[PDB]
Design a binder for these strands. Structure first.
Lengths: 122, 130
RNA sequence: CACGGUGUGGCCGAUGACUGGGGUGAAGUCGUAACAAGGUAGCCGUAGGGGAACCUGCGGCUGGAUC
RNA sequence: CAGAAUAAGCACCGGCUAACUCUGUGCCAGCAGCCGCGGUAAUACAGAGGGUGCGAGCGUUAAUCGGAUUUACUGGGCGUAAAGCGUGCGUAGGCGGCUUAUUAAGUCGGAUGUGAAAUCCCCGAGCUUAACUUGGGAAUUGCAUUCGAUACUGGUGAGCUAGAGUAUGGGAGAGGAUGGUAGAAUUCCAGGUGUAGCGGUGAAAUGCGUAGAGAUCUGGAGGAAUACCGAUGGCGAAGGCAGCCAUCUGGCCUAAUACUGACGCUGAGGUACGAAAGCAUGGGGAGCAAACAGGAUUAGAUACCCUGGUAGUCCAUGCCGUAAACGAUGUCUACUAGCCGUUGGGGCCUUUGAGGCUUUAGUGGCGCAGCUAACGCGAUAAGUAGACCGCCUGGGGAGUACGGUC
RNA sequence: UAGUUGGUGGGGUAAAGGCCUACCAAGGCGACGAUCUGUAGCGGGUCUGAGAGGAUGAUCCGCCACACUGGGACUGAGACACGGCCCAGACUCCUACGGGAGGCAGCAGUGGGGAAUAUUGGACAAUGGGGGGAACCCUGAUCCAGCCAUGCCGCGUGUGUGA
């Protein structure tokens, strides 16, 4: 561009959108479990992965993955959700914090315990 | 149309050096003669001549080649009609860490950035030569 | 003069029986339009026709093979 | 005074990235920031052993700048990757030839005042050290007033002709608008000669014909288009423009004097022109031919092929405003090896008439330097520079919805 | 845009002024963005960046504005006044039904919201502020204490020997 063109119209910046709109710029959110179920991965992956549709205090309804092996979640549980995508599951952009409100820490786990929220064995 | 005669002169010199001519000629003006005088004093060119027929004035410059390459390896116009550039005495540009010269027009005439800093004045930055 | 009332008209937002198109997924069904001269060279504008990719008329381009 | 007595966890070990093996499970369970692991030997899943990095902390999520030259002022692009408006004219604006005198607005320099303290940085001081506190500096890149300089830009006065334009001679052209007119051919009609086929296809059939075709000869009617010349030719801003003649009319090339004296370039908004198809009103209709009808082909044919055929294609008066409207290359100016063609002019030379050198404005083919990712471009630049404008910022959704104008 | 832009006479203010008023005139602003509309307290500063820039305005300091929601004025040197007055509105409380009362965006604290942020503490000894001649009184400013690994800095959880 010429100097005159820049003076008449300056450079324009395009705004950026967040990848976790439902959090509304908060580290975590609290929600009530609306539907717990399992889904199947996108190709070339094959499994049965545990997810749940949750309604948040932000006024949104989203889907959240459940990490670890073995959970006690069910209908109407109260859970804390954080950010993080599952990649091979389309549309699942959030994670459930293990052992926070009604979710419990995984059992018989001795490494990476701070994740999955398992206390020290005696 | 032609709107920057100084840029035209610098372009003529650059093209002549790249084509390996011995002399280059153009329509003349006092500003062009003043710039050519500074170039000759600094040693980038050999001879500057002015001829007058009746009212037309022709300026002729003799070029220098040392070894195989031309002496002037780079000449850039800095101030242009679409953007004038003015510098204070403490912000005069340095060319190739002092191995090249910046041509500056000050209230005491046309000189190099070195002489301008010595005299403690600023002005318009015409060109970089190296 | 604040608050309030009446009538009429704007704008924003939420909501609505029904309806239209878009994307993603899985390849269930009907074909084979494009990629080679892809088996009628392809594409652009416009008009008409057709279950569907598309077909035909007029003008244009080579980002068309062989001669 | 007492006595080691009261006091270590968290993440990770396929690559990006320092640190590897064994068991358990078998596209399951599961991991995952990106690329990707697991479908019987998993250094990538879980446990264990070992190790690595941190350490009263260790990890995850969220947010800002950076890396991102990924809005490019410093510091990017537009032939083919995204990107030059279809083409002109022109308003505001931006920029603008040479010489001279003057002004001191831009520009540069000095002085004075101000720019609170805290904060940042430097030299010290006090905290057992450090954080922290604190003295003095430096800095606060700015603003205002006043005094100076005049090279450049701007203003004013004067002058000049290389840009731009005017008058007089000559030249080429499918440039435009209007009206006449000529020949070839197709269709139809009328009439002679004449008698069983004609037509069409890969092969056929639909179709035409014994109330007489097709073929051949004569005459008539009507519409549309202009063979040969014809050309990598010409003219036009682009879209485009071809028989011949007259009338009205625009631009271009070329020679020398004369004249004005910067009167210039570009151009947001705006405005004019703008292929084909399409629309409105009235005419015309030979040939061709969307839609449609029939015959074939095919598994099916909606198509390609064949026989017919209506809008339309043509004219007058208006609208529409879009094309791969392309050189996929905005306009203007200057400079930078050569070789070979062609169109319209000027000049010189022979020497008698046809050639040979130059110069100018167009139009083509190669190619040095230079440029480019490469292909390629290369005086008709995509090279070297200047002025102004338009446009681009991953692929889809999408030149779409809503609103508005026409 | 019609008190709108300017002028004259008058009024009004501590003070210039369409600040108000009666006439006279038709001006004033706008592509250098008027009007309308969305968002927003501003600066010294803070974070990042080689710089140019970008993001930001907790804690400290200066300025501005507000005090349940709107409209007013009084007293006073000074207010259109957080813990003053009048009026209107919504809400809450006491009542013997006669009549009344109130405003934590001061400190502590409760409910609610939220991923999430503390004690219904001590003293005016120090620095300030108000009153008083003084003695002295008041001061949730302030100076201190309590809670929280929230951050920065420092220390410890032992040392040598021992195959």
């Amino acid at each position: 561009a010429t100097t005159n063109q820049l003076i008449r119209k300056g450079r324009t910046t395009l705004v950026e959108k967040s990848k976790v709109p439902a959090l509304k710029a908060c580290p975590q959110r609290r929600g009530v479990c609306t539907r717990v179920y399992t889904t199947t991965p996108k190709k070339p992956n094959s499994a049965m992965r545990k997810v749940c549709r949750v309604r948040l205090t932000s006024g949104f309804e989203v889907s959240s993955y459940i990490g670890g092996e073995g959970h006690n979640l069910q209908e109407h549980s109260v859970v804390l959700i954080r950010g993080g995508r599952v990649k091979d599951l389309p549309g699942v952009r959030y994670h459930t914090v293990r052992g926070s409100l009604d979710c419990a820490g995984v059992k018989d786990r001795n490494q990476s315990r701070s994740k999955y929220g398992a206390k020290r064995p005696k | 149309s032609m709107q920057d005669t100084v840029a035209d002169m610098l372009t003529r010199v650059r093209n002549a050096q790249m084509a390996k001519k011995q002399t280059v000629s153009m329509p003349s003006s006092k500003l062009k003669v003043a710039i050519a005088n500074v170039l000759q004093q600094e040693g980038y060119i050999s001879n500057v001549e002015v001829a007058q027929e009746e009212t037309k004035s022709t300026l002729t410059i003799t070029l220098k080649y040392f070894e195989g390459k031309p002496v002037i390896e780079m000449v850039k116009r800095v101030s242009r009609p679409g953007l004038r550039q003015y510098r204070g005495k403490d912000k005069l540009p340095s060319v190739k860490q002092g191995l090249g010269i910046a041509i500056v027009s000050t209230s005491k005439g046309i000189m190099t950035d070195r002489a301008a800093r010595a005299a403690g004045i600023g002005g318009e930055v015409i060109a970089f030569v190296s």
